[PDB]
Design a protein around this ligand. Structure first.
Ligand SMILES: C=CCOP(=O)(O)OC[C@H]1O[C@@H](n2cnc3c(N)ncnc32)[C@H](O)[C@@H]1O
Length: 652
């Protein structure tokens, strides 16, 4: 075979995992929406793509969402000029479909499981309580003069009220622009200025992993260079003394106390912007209302086989698109219970995730590979002794998942009884693009499998632009047609939007990842095209090599980048993080990096061997969990910021 799976210790003949009994409607579990085999997936998938899919999408749009005014046209526009349209004549409100209509049905039903940084301070937040706090904040925003189309910045930590902040902006037609609680004043500054918002929401302080976040302090430093900001709503999260600017800053609780607990919904056009999300100049991705909301609802319902009574647990942060889509809009659109996790995976201990699952009986869990590798690094005592039988599905998101981690996830977290869904997508896709449907697809470690409804992808040659037709091919991934949840522009920078995604390969959407469709049709996302290494003509993906390195005993996490090599063009350079146990004194470093080079030669090839390996305590990662390989590539070429100092030193 030309295309090989990500290196794994299990033989390929014993590495295919059919949907287990919890996803077969047995043991009293819900029957999956799509099942039981790959055929049942294509039968429905094929309805959602091609020129004959309008009828299907028109129905799902009316099945999934409540509409103030119905739509006439289903889709229009294209990539060329960035004029994507979906249900343009229709109107709705995001807050209504995430709150009101569910409050009217079961008001005492839990909407949010607020898992506070301290486990004892956790509680349930019903829809009634959530809708009421949302309407109060909306009325506060309206009292500040916020109008439909105005941008509002949200600098909130993972407290449950962040959902109220989001939905309050969408209730009145404003455009919220959420920023990671923890970002520096300079990063916050640039994002508050680009969106030109006049209102800012934040807390006095944040709490994560037992460490405080001086949100109001960082905000004060930022707003010194944000002239437009006139009003700041400050939430009392810790109650510790923080500076408050007279006139500009008002307390959340005191402002909401003056307002009613209901607020009418603004009638939004399908294509009115819902939010701006800036990606780490700053790129403010913009999403519309109807299309983004429909994509998050359908993906959640089908990719996680969500049912009315489930308790979905996405452990991401709302500063990330993963939180936007699968903490707030997605789950609450479907009217179920969702989790707001304020802590880390290892506070107070590396058992927190599992203490959480058994406490609330999470029916699905959804986190990043960087966290799965973290818990793997901490031993199996923290997880082995839990029940966790309430789970049915386990999700990975943010990067390629090494089969080694995929197995640990499958073994201990799911006790080999849960489906593993490797969900591939981007901030610019709005919702999950390629992922296995858990009740129908048999999984391969590290493979996203097949594309989701509305997504028709192709493998194109990166230079010629020709479609590699069929199986056992590899290249760069691209989409053939728009999908409902696709981003519509970059805020006040539609040229960057077209030049980044639409002009590289005229006719398609350009994700920026390498991909391979193996002999069975499974898709394999190998990493960022920018991270590809060209060793004497061979194109090495970062997932291939990293997955191989983590196959050696004691390896915790790895990151490989490229650098100029006179003989080979580029050479591979590896940054390796070893587990706590591994005694770096007893074992010669030279002998270790030599065993690793061999490990790569044996499974990949004699060209993928690193020309140099660096041992480091950690890796440069973003808040979401992405490994910042561009940094490592820049260094070799000459979150926790203190990790860059160790790299510049260990490399030099
Ligand atoms: C997850 C959504 C939000 O991610 P965002 O911050 O927009 O970054 C998107 C990128 O994450 C990678 N990526 C994400 N999921 C996967 C995945 N499942 N496998 C491999 N790479 C992945 C892949 O490079 C993609 O372009």
């Amino acid at each position: 075979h030309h295309v090989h799976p990500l290196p794994d210790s299990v033989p390929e003949s014993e590495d295919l995992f059919a949907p287990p009994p919890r996803m077969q409607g047995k043991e009293g579990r819900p029957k999956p929406h799509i099942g039981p085999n790959y055929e049942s997936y294509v039968k429905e998938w094929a309805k959602t793509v091609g020129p004959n899919s309008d009828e299907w999408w028109a129905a799902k749009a009316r099945e999934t969402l409540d509409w103030y005014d119905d739509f006439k046209t289903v889709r229009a526009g294209g990539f060329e000029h960035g004029d994507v349209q979906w249900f343009p004549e229709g109107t709705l409100n995001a807050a209504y479909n995430c709150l009101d209509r569910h409050y009217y049905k079961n008001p005492k039903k839990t909407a949010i499981i607020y898992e506070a940084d301290e486990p004892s301070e956790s509680r349930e937040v019903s829809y009634e309580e959530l809708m009421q706090e949302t309407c109060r904040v909306a009325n506060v925003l309206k009292s500040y003069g916020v109008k439909k189309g105005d941008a509002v910045s949200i600098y909130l930590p993972m407290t449950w009220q962040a959902a109220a902040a989001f939905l309050a902006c969408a209730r009145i037609g404003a455009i919220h622009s959420a920023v990671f609680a923890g970002f520096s004043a300079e990063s916050l500054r640039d994002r508050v200025n680009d969106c030109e918002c006049k209102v800012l929401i934040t807390t006095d302080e944040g709490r994560r992993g037992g460490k405080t976040i001086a949100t109001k302090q960082i905000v004060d430093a930022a707003l010194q260079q944000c002239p437009l900001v006139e009003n700041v709503l400050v939430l009392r999260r810790t109650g510790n003394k923080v500076p408050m600017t007279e006139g500009r800053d008002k307390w959340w609780d005191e402002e909401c106390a003056k307002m009613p607990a209901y607020c009418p919904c603004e009638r939004m056009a399908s294509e009115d912007p819902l939010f701006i999300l800036y990606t780490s100049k700053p790129k403010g991705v913009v999403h519309s209302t109807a299309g983004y909301l429909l994509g998050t609802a359908l993906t959640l319902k089908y990719v996680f086989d969500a049912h009315p009574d489930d308790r979905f647990a996405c452990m991401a942060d709302i500063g990330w698109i993963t939180g936007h889509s699968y903490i707030i809009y997605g789950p609450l659109a479907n009217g179920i219970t969702t989790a707001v996790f304020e802590s880390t995976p290892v506070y107070p201990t590396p058992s927190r995730y599992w203490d959480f699952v058994d406490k609330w009986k999470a029916t699905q869990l959804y986190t990043a590979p960087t966290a799965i590798r973290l818990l793997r690094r901490m031993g199996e005592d923290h997880v082995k002794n839990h029940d966790l039988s309430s789970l049915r599905v386990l999700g990975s998101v943010g990067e390629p998942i090494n089969p080694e981690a995929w197995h640990w996830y499958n073994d201990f977290a799911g006790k080999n009884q849960c489906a593993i869904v490797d969900t591939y997508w981007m901030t610019e896709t709005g919702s999950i693009s390629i992922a296995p449907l858990p009740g129908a697809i048999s999984t391969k470690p590290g493979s996203a499998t097949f594309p989701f409804f509305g997504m028709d992808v192709d493998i194109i040659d990166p230079q010629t632009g020709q479609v590699l037709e069929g199986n056992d091919v590899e290249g760069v991934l691209v989409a053939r047609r728009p999908w409902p949840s696709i981003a519509r522009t970059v805020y006040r920078d539609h040229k960057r939007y077209l030049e980044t995604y639409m002009k590289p390969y005229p006719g398609y959407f350009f994700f920026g990842d390498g991909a391979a469709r193996d002999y069975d049709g499974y898709m394999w996302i190998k990493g960022r095209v920018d991270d590809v290494i060209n060793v004497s003509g061979h194109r090495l993906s970062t997932a291939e090599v990293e997955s191989a390195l983590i196959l050696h005993k004691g390896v915790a996490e790895t990151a490989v980048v490229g650098c100029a090599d006179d003989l080979t063009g580029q050479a591979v350079y590896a940054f390796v993080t070893m587990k706590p146990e591994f005694d770096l004194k007893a074992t010669k470093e030279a002998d270790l990096s030599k065993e690793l080079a061999i490990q790569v030669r044996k499974v990949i090839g004699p060209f993928a061997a690193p020309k140099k390996i660096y041992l480091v305590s950690d890796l440069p990662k973003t808040r979401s969990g992405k490994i910042m390989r561009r940094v490592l590539r820049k260094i070799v070429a000459g979150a926790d910021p203190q990790i860059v100092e160790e790299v510049k030193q260990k490399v030099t």
